[PDB]
């Protein structure tokens, strides 16, 4: 596997929130992301964007 901090999905979906100023809104951030092939769609939903 690729490094869990700069993978095409993590430099996209993790680096987005890390750069913009989001975090774990409870500790689910990793859980949410990984289970949805690194999804910011459902991640952003709880990280202060309750509407896309």
Number of Cα atoms under 13 Å in the Cβ half of residue 22: 21
Given the candidates 3.40.50.300, 1.10.8.10, 3.90.1300.10, 3.40.190.10, the CATH classification of the domain at 1-52 is 1.10.8.10
Tokens coding 51: 């509407």
Neighbours of 31 (CB within 10 A): 11
Contact criterion met (CB below 8 Å) for 5 and 30: no
- The CA dihedral of 20, 50, 52, 34, to the nearest 10 degrees, is 70
The phi and psi torsions of 43 (rounded to 5 degrees) equal: -70, -50
In the PDB record, what is the listed experimental method? Answer: NMR
CA distance 1 to 27: 23
């Amino acid at each position: 596997g690729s490094p869990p901090e700069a993978d095409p999905r993590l430099i996209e979906s993790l680096s987005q929130m890390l750069s913009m100023g989001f975090s774990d809104e409870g500790g689910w951030l990793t859980r949410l992301l990984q289970t949805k092939n690194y999804d910011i769609g459902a991640a952003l939903d709880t990280i202060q964007y309750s509407k896309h």
